[PDB]
Amino acid sequence: MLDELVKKELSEEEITEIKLEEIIKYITLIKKSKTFVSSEIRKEELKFLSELAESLFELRLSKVLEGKVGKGFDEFIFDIFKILKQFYVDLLTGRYIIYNDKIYCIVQKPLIYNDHRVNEGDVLVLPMREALPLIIASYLTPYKIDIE
Amino acid sequence: MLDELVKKELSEEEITEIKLEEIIKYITLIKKSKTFVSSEIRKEELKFLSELAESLFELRLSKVLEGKVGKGFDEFIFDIFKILKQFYVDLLTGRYIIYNDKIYCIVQKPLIYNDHRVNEGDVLVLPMREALPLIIASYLTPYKIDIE
Amino acid sequence: MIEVKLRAIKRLSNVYTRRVMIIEDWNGSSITTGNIELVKGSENQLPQWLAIILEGKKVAKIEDKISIEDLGRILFQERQNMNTPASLVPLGKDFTSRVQLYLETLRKDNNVESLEKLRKSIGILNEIIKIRLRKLIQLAFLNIDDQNLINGMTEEELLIYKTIKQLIKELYGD
Amino acid sequence: MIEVKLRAIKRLSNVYTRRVMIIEDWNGSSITTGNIELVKGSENQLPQWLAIILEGKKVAKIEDKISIEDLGRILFQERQNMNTPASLVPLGKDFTSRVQLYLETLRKDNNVESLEKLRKSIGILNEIIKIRLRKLIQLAFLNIDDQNLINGMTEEELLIYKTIKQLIKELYGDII
Fold first, then answer.
1. Which chains touch C (3 or more CB pairs under 8 A)?
2. Nearest CA in chain D to A59
3. CB contact under 8 A, B52 and D12
4. Fold of the domain spanning D68-175
5. How many Cβ atoms sit within 10 Å of the Cβ of residue A21?
6. How far apart are CA A15 and CA A23, in angstroms?
7. D15-62 is classed in which CATH architecture?
């Protein structure tokens, strides 16, 4: 249950190993409950369960910020967080080429931008607000300057 | 340098408004310095600036975790963090259809997945570690089970 | 500083077990408790969120509610040894949740008596919080790990106590 | 969240401004200061990391180092009004880093006189920390106008002070 996962996350200093099998088991329980749980109880319980899941995310992400190593089903979520941090550090240390709010990027996979086809190896200049999601999705990588 | 932004972030409870022009100012100085700053001084200095950039990210993300509303050049980074949070809550509250480690998603833009072309409106069942980056890049949107 | 953990503690308290005397038959289900069947004249243990729903429907009644007399008694016992840091009254983990529910019901009724009783309760709680914080911070500054004292702290107070202990040890041990 | 602020404080101490006495002519550059020209006999202000680099090259000498005589004077002034929470001696944000530098040079010498000054300085520091921490905790509960007192705190003491005031306020809001 979610309350158990939140309670163990508060008491432990390290990030608890929440395996994917346990998450799939609890999601199956939620789906099965639709057969027996009334709509009134299910609606009120959704608020308290979503608040517990929200806290579980916050507690585990706080430990990631403090320096704890994340392991479990949500490791792919923490990896996205590390990409956000590395983009942040590269940007402030001048490793990127910025024109106003746009950034130079190298295309990794065939992509359609502004109704135009770009292929792997091409260079695209586009706002950071649109480049970073495409970086996380491995469609783009930022053009890097070696300031060392 | 970046120490100005870190000090102000460390003293105020709310997220400081760091305009993009402030970031451009420091990036410009880092770029110009490569022509007249010795490599010995510049290497040690860039190490300190990189650590200060990490701290600025960590301090502002800590305030986002607590509920503060962020405004500034890095607002698009915080919005991605909220996408990770909402995906986490929706998953643990049974709002997504999960099949083994995969998840049902609705296609939003033309997509090439596994060398196969899919278009808007199509449904794709792919692993979560691959689906979430495509959700952030607006190529996919997870199929949300309507309650009741 | 500890806003994330304070919310997590509060949201955990909505699932804490509460004693309830069932007054009307009712059978239903939830994700937490599964299929349950209640019966009149039988005390049962339910999560706090479910007990509040069943109390508003007059299905059952919550028994272990905090009162203004309990707050005045805690304040009195706290003033007897105001300068003694190791004289915290043992409150427990459910004290904060029961107080939050007490102020929630008074503010929901919106009666005139609920307003003046609320102001009197806030004045008592402010005196209780200040005195207990004086003792709790001093215990952290003195660095005294007493298992009997730690149990007497609420979850929120224990978090504050450990945060300042670790902050002093890290800053003046480095 | 305290761990994030600890790293930020430790990383800020590298860029504290230090008053340095120039002993040898040297013109150089850095990203922080740009191109600067240092002349003998003139005091200048430099970031701490750069002042240490120029000190190791015998280019200049840091002037505002802390000493055991300074530690004894601070302990004396702190003892003058131990029960007064608003009687903190103004130290500065760079005080902690300067003390760590003075203690590190005493360990580097490895002399009998240096190890004796190291133990005595640690003893004085312990008494200073005890007195200042007690005044700091009381100051956090007093709710007084604290602007000159905040300026007089070190960076680590300011973190302790504001963390206590924030924890008290957050517990008040969570209960009330």
1. A, B, D
2. D1
3. yes
4. Methane Monooxygenase Hydroxylase; Chain G, domain 1 (1.20.58)
5. 9
6. 16
7. 3-Layer(aba) Sandwich (3.40)
